[PDB]
Scaffold this active site. Structure first.
Site, PDB file in Angstrom:
ATOM      1  N   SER A 184      15.764   0.110  -5.894  1.00  0.00           N
ATOM      2  CA  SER A 184      14.398   0.049  -6.413  1.00  0.00           C
ATOM      3  C   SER A 184      14.443   0.125  -7.936  1.00  0.00           C
ATOM      4  O   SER A 184      15.017  -0.786  -8.553  1.00  0.00           O
ATOM      5  CB  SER A 184      13.604   1.123  -5.696  1.00  0.00           C
ATOM      6  N   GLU A 318       9.783  -4.066   3.290  1.00  0.00           N
ATOM      7  CA  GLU A 318       9.688  -3.284   2.053  1.00  0.00           C
ATOM      8  C   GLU A 318       8.344  -2.596   1.824  1.00  0.00           C
ATOM      9  O   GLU A 318       8.259  -1.363   1.850  1.00  0.00           O
ATOM     10  CB  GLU A 318       9.965  -4.172   0.845  1.00  0.00           C
ATOM     11  N   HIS A 414      10.785   0.066   2.684  1.00  0.00           N
ATOM     12  CA  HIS A 414      11.447   0.419   1.433  1.00  0.00           C
ATOM     13  C   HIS A 414      12.125   1.776   1.541  1.00  0.00           C
ATOM     14  O   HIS A 414      11.553   2.729   2.079  1.00  0.00           O
ATOM     15  CB  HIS A 414      10.397   0.428   0.316  1.00  0.00           C
TER      16      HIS A 414
END
Ligand SMILES: O=C(O)c1ccc(C(=O)NCCO)cc1
Length: 494
Positions: A184, A318, A414
């Protein structure tokens, strides 16, 4: 006890269970007061032995939003001396070990190098020297001010990688076989570092987990963000003024800015650009004409990083992390999805392509897949497409395993791959559940070690003809070709 002489003084670590571990080695002086905003300063040399058995303080951060925070439980450590790094090695006196350097994620506002899920012991037991570290976050790390160098957090990351260059051989590592990796914001940081001459030669390979080269704050937006912060603090938008604000007040205002931008910003406060969505992350790195003269993806399109081996990937679902846990999805309407697509210039029927490829039947699920593509999947593919003629290699993955948490509403959301990479499944039960499949953590972790060791994770390289990636999933992990092709093509001109 085990004492290693760094380039600036001895440090005392611990050798237990076959592995030597050093925690809290400073690489930059405490960023206190005005030094919140200065370039990182090398630590003052010392005589004797500095204790390096305990993690240091972490960087100031506000709590995660409650729903997210229930899934990602952060471990805060108080103190001022937080620009430190940590090393795990199987033998400090070994020669030539691959080195992995982890850059943590957390939207540039949260995270630390020492979170329990980022434990490096599994890498050390596989013969790799593992490094993690803290870098400056939020306003302190990234707010743009006329009287301070931009992107302190990125300057910190360069300083930590320079410490690894100049010290890791003393811990058994080969500085010429460094793999940097992050997830990320940490992966967006890796793309930003690939893009600037200021960090060339600091790593030989890169792994990008759920982050690409699309995350930069336009200088004019960063100025707006500073002005709102200073107004709410009753001071001037300068480092000269913010140097004196108590950190809890900094964090409280930082929290409100982030909530406001992640929602629907009020034009009266934020101007037309930001109210219109020009900013995805308000404390992402600013385009400064120093470290960033353009979005990292465009530097990479120009050949930046083409000599660095690349492993990249995303999770299937995600953005469900940011939309599902708060009950947002059932209320989303077809007209809202249509309007969303129309901001990118796409017709209403683009949503049918998502339904046809099994990426959502209800408007809310379709929306989550669309935003997954816009923020993660397509940006990752653009970096890969840019590297068609690169001398270095490029490999891709999709992490498809779905977590059962929150009654199955997250899917392959995610951050779900993190404990599999680190074989720290037992430290991430809030996200992956209480009985995730160890076999998959074995598979994923071993491919990361293979990629660090050799530059090849053990599967065919990615190219624009077959667009092949390794699809990680529990019973069976296996190669697939050009996944979600119709939804991919919708973004070709966009
Ligand atoms: O696009 C977003 O909103 C976003 C992107 C990346 C992160 C991150 O780096 N951390 C994961 C959980 O915070 C956070 C939020």
């Amino acid at each position: 006890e085990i004492v290693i002489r760094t380039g600036s003084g001895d440090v005392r670590g611990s050798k237990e269970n076959g592995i030597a571990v050093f925690r809290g080695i400073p690489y930059a002086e405490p960023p206190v007061g005005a030094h919140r905003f200065t370039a990182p300063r090398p630590p003052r040399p010392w005589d004797g032995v500095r204790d390096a058995t305990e993690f240091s303080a972490t960087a100031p951060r506000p709590p995660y939003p409650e729903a997210i925070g229930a899934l990602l439980i952060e471990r805060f450590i108080p103190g001022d001396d937080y620009l430190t790094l940590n090393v795990w090695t199987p033998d400090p006196n070994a020669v030539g070990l691959p080195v992995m350097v982890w850059i943590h994620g957390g939207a540039f506002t949260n995270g630390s190098g020492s979170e329990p899920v980022y434990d490096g012991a599994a890498f050390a037991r596989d013969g790799v020297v593992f490094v993690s570290f803290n870098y400056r976050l939020g306003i302190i790390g990234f707010a743009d001010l006329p009287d301070a160098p931009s992107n302190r957090g990125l300057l910190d990351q360069i300083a930590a990688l320079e410490w690894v260059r100049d010290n890791i051989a003393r811990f058994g590592g080969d500085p010429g076989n460094v793999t940097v990796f992050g997830e990320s914001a940490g992966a967006m940081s890796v793309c930003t570092l690939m893009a600037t001459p200021r960090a060339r030669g600091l790593f030989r390979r890169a792994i990008l987990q759920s982050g690409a080269g699309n995350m930069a704050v336009a200088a004019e937006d960063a100025t707006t963000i500073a002005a709102v912060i200073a107004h709410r603090l009753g001071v001037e938008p300068t480092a000269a003024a913010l140097a004196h604000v108590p950190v809890a007040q900094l964090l409280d205002v930082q929290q409100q800015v982030a909530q406001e931008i992640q929602g629907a910003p009020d034009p009266a406060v934020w101007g037309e650009r930001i109210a219109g969505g020009s900013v995805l992350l308000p404390f992402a790195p600013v385009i400064d004409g120093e470290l960033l003269s353009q979005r990292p993806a465009e530097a990479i399109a120009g050949g930046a990083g083409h000599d660095v081996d690349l492993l990249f990937g995303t999770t299937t679902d995600e953005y469900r992390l940011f939309l599902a846990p708060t009950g947002l999805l059932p209320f989303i309407t077809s007209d809202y999805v249509t309007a969303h697509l129309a901001k990118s210039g796409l017709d209403a029927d683009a949503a049918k392509a998502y339904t046809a490829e099994g990426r959502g039947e209800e408007p809310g699920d379709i929306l989550a897949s669309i935003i997954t593509d816009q923020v993660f999947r397509i940006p990752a593919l653009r970096i890969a497409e840019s590297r068609v003629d690169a001398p270095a290699r490029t490999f891709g993955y999709e992490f498809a395993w779905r977590t059962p948490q929150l009654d199955g509403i997250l899917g392959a959301c995610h951050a779900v791959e993190l404990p599999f990479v680190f074989r720290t499944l037992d430290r991430a039960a809030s996200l992956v559940g209480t009985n995730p499949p160890e076999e998959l953590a074995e598979t994923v972790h071993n491919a990361w070690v293979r990629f660090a060791t050799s530059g090849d994770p053990g599967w065919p390289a990615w190219n624009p003809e077959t667009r092949s990636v390794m699809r990680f999933d529990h019973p069976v992990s296996e190669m697939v070709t050009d996944p979600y092709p119709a939804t991919r093509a919708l973004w070709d001109g966009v």
